[PDB]
RNA sequence: AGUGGUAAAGGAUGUGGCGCCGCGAAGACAGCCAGGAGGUUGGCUUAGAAGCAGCCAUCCUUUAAAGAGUGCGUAAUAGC
RNA sequence: AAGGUAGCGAAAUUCCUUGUCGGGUAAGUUCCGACCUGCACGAAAAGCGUAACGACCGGAGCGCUGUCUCGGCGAGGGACC
RNA sequence: CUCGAUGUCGGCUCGUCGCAUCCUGGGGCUGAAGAAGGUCCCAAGGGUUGGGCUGUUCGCCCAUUAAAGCGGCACGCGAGCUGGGUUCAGAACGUCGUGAGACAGUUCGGUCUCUAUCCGCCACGGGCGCAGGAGGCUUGAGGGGGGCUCUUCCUAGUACG
RNA sequence: GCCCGGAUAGCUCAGUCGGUAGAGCAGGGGAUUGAAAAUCCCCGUGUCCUUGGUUCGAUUCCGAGUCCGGGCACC
């Protein structure tokens, strides 16, 4: 559900679907990347080529696994953990990416883009 | 000019004959330039000594170079301090008091801000991301070989 | 502006003000607020 | 300072009164309370009346370097020969003749003391010539 | 003042006390009224000193008795 | 009495030391690698190295795991009548 | 006082007061336009993060943060832990010593006990009483608990300009 | 962080118990050669690091800044 150190995942333009936030970029007492939420990150796996990196950025909470529990009582889980990574402002980095849909990330918002863009099976 | 007469004011000029600057200096500004001993970085230790003597325009680690400006002198006379280093580590022993030393950032910008506080030759050395302003020679030593005042 | 001590007056008239055991020096200029209390 | 080219190493502490009181140009500036002063001090007030005195027209002396003052060690725990020569000054206690000139012609001379003393160490006070004196 | 009921340097239109200074009822000082006088008009600088821009001036007439003008100031100047 | 060779070096000997560079790393006085002005290495009480083998001592990293973010309920034994 | 005996570090866990207050606010001041700084007096209310390496608290560094304070109590805490530590013998060399042995040079290991009596704290009860003998509902002098703060958005870029 | 240190021309560097400023190399004018190296005379350039003090005068003796200076550090 949520971590400090963290061996997350991802599929922007990653250098690897993976990387360890340190913690929560919320109110100063983090202890949990939560879902739809944003914080802070280097990479942990590898990556061909790609302009992206083993830097760090910080970004926003995708999937989680442990109770997503929505305003509508409307609820989910998926075996799965990742974000996608930001850059400055959040405008999110890649152009595309391997997932989909469902309110919490929408909901949170500032990212429509990440919105339209991980529609469809997968 | 524009900020006396608040943008009501215009006046343009051209040459009446060809004089020889007179005896006087046209300025030649007010609050020397604090300019740099070396390339390298900002070092809180080094920025926290000569901070009270006027202001600062880069931080830390900011590593500038030599003749790049990093604030102005709290009078009219220049100088070229220097720090890094921020000097030194460390330990032990021991501990565990004390002090802590912080300091302010800029007081940064603008251009537009910074451009206008020349003078003799401060080049503002401006890039696709960023402002700097170094005078005509960095070298400190080197400033003195074009003043060389009289006679 | 305060100063457990000093106060000699300044503004060139400035105010010898007796409050509360307060060596209070009032003046016409903010400079001079001397609060010695 | 100056106690130059003494000939001992040092002296002992006691206090109580001496015989400083005359004038000597009508400029001065008296101890009162004391006891011995920082030769340096002094150099203090030197400057400070100096200085003030549109800094030239001379100032005259008073008291002297006088002893040797010594805190021995440096820190450490004691039972040195006390030896170690350190602070030298004078040795002035019952409001004593310190006499200063310059031409100051005002209480101008006074800032100059007012200052000067103020700072030096002890209750203090200052005039001029006051009951003349007649020696032989 | 609660000092009583620990403290110095030193600061002060504290409190009270001297032993002292101003009283031209030729009726006082803070409060008041009005005038704030004509040569006062460079000396440099005069872009301006024509007291109220810097290097000193130390005189005269003249009456509310006289500011060699203590002071708000800019372009002098003009007003307090 | 000659005055330390060969290899060797900030090491189960560098105090100035968290030495300086380099690597590892979000960061590291930690160790590996360099450098080598070796507070005070050196062949015979061995010196440099040297596979296998150590309940050796120290440095990484994959794996796994109430171990850690506090743990939370649970069973068996004393505690208690 | 203490050698008929007072466990010294580092850390842990529970902390308790303190202000020369760090974030908090209240402020006069600015060389204060605004904003933002910076300059003192008032006031402890709550609050006053994670890791890295280092046995080190200090420290330097990563990432934030409103902020990530100084310090009182044997540098609080062994009758409550931990025990890397420096400090019993080993052995190691580096270093002195003719060598026995040694170095607050160093490095590898290195047998921390605890059935509470007292006052003290946490709870829970047995008395005997607040002059009829009773079942039940109250009001509180007085004492205890918690009083933080982000960032965004609202009036926001008309205050200053 | 206490403790010393250097600051002098174009760059590296000394000073009766103050009163004067220097070689070196860069350097341009020569002597020299066949021309040139080397060498020998000459030129030049002076913030004597910024302040405050002592003196008639301080680059110097003192105060402060200044890169700079070797060193201090178990519970």
Not at chain 2, 37 to 46: E, H, L, P, S
Request: aromatic share 6%; hydrophobic share 40%.
């Amino acid at each position: 559900m949520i971590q400090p150190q963290t061996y997350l995942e991802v599929a922007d333009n990653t250098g690897a679907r993976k990387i360890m936030c340190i913690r929560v970029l919320k109110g100063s007492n983090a202890k949990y990347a939560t879902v739809g939420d944003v914080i802070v990150a280097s990479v942990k796996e590898a990556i061909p080529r790609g302009a992206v990196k083993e830097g760090d950025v910080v970004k926003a909470v995708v999937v989680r696994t442990k109770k997503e529990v929505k305003r509508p009582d409307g609820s989910a889980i998926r075996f799965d953990d990742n974000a996608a990574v930001i850059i400055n402002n959040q405008l999110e980095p890649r152009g595309t990416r391997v997932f989909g849909p469902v309110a919490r990330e929408l909901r949170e918002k500032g990212f429509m883009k990440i919105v339209s863009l991980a529609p469809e099976v997968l | 000019f524009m900020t006396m007469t608040s943008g009501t004011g215009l006046l343009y000029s051209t040459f009446s004959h060809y004089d020889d600057v007179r005896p006087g200096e046209v300025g030649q500004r007010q609050n020397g330039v604090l300019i740099s001993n070396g390339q390298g970085k900002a070092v809180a230790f080094a920025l926290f000594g000569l901070q009270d003597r006027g202001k600062l325009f880069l931080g830390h680690g900011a590593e500038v170079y030599e003749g790049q400006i990093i604030g102005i002198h709290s009078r009219s006379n220049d100088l070229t301090v220097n720090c890094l280093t921020g000097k030194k580590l460390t330990n032990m022993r021991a501990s565990g008091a004390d002090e802590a030393v912080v300091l302010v950032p800029p007081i940064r910008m603008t251009l537009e801000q910074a451009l206008e506080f020349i003078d003799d030759d401060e080049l503002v050395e401006v890039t696709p991301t960023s402002i700097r302003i170094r005078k005509r020679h960095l070298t400190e030593n080197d400033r003195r070989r074009a003043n060389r005042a009289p006679k | 502006m305060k100063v457990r001590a000093s106060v000699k007056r300044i503004c060139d008239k400035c105010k010898v003000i007796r409050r509360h055991g307060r060596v209070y020096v009032i003046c016409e200029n903010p400079k001079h607020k001397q609060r010695q209390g | 300072r100056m106690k130059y080219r003494k000939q001992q190493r040092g002296r002992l502490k006691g206090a109580t009164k001496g015989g400083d009181y005359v004038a000597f140009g009508d400029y001065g500036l008296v101890a009162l309370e004391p006891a011995w002063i920082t030769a340096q001090q002094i150099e203090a007030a030197r400057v400070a009346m100096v200085r003030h005195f549109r800094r030239g027209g001379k100032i005259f002396i008073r008291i002297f370097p006088d002893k040797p003052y010594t805190k021995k060690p440096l820190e450490v725990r004691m039972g040195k020969g006390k030896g170690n020569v350190e602070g030298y000054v004078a040795v002035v206690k019952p409001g004593r003749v310190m006499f200063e000139v310059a031409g100051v012609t005002e209480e101008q001379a006074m800032e100059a003391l007012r200052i000067a003393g103020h700072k030096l160490p002890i209750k203090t006070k200052i005039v001029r010539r006051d009951a003349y004196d007649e020696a032989q």
